[PDB]
Amino acid sequence: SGAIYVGNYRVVNRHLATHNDWANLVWEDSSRDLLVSSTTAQGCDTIARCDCQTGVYYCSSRRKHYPVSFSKPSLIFVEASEYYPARYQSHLMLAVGHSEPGDCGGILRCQHGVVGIVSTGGNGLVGFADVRDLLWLDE
Numbered sequence: 001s002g003a004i005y006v007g008n009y010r011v012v013n014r015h016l017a018t019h020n021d022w023a024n025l026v027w028e029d030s031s032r033d034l035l036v037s038s039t040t041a042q043g044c045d046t047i048a049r050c051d052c053q054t055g056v057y058y059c060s061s062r063r064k065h066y067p068v069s070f071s072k073p074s075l076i077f078v079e080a081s082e083y084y085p086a087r088y089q090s091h092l093m094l095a096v097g098h099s100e101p102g103d104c105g106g107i108l109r110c111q112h113g114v115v116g117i118v119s120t121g122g123n124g125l126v127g128f129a130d131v132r133d134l135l136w137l138d139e
């Protein structure tokens with residue numbers, strides 16, 4: 001679990017969005033596993049606007065932060081699951097690191113701010129849904 005709170009927006013993994021997120025829907029994209037809902041309170045987070053390929057992410061299954069080198073956002077194949085058919089997930093960044101399904105929502109940060117959230121992984125890999133291209137989150 002986890003979310004980004006920026007301005008009057010809440011960014012979550014689309015597969016973990018609650019009934020309240022869908023009732024306050026701003027935007028969603030199944031191909032990116034992202035959903036953004038509106039909030040009444042002002043958020044605590046800053047979004048990175050950069051091309052960093054290193055950063056640190058929070059891993060709830062280890063209660064620890066880990067440093068990572070990750071690939072640029074791209075289209076990556078993800079197997080079918082209970083929430084999605086087998087498909088290419090877009091705007092995904094991979095790195096070598098530990099992750100389990102419940103780690104989705106952990107934040108990846110660089111020196112500039114929030115880069116994305118954990119969305120996929122397996123076998124010593126961790127994948128992050130990028131949010132740096134969503135310029136409208138800042139306004």
Ligand SMILES: COc1ccncc1CC(=O)N1C[C@@H](C(N)=O)C[C@@H]2CCCC[C@H]21
Pocket residue numbers: 015033078081082083084089099100101102103104118119120121122123
């Ligand atoms: C952090 O996730 C890990 C990590 C390790 N092994 C597995 C996973 C879990 C994983 O990759 N997926 C794919 C995800 C997606 N973006 O399509 C969402 C799915 C929700 C239902 C369980 C399967 C999940």
Ligand SMILES: [Zn+2]
Pocket residue numbers: 048049050051052110111112113
């Ligand atoms: Zn950066």
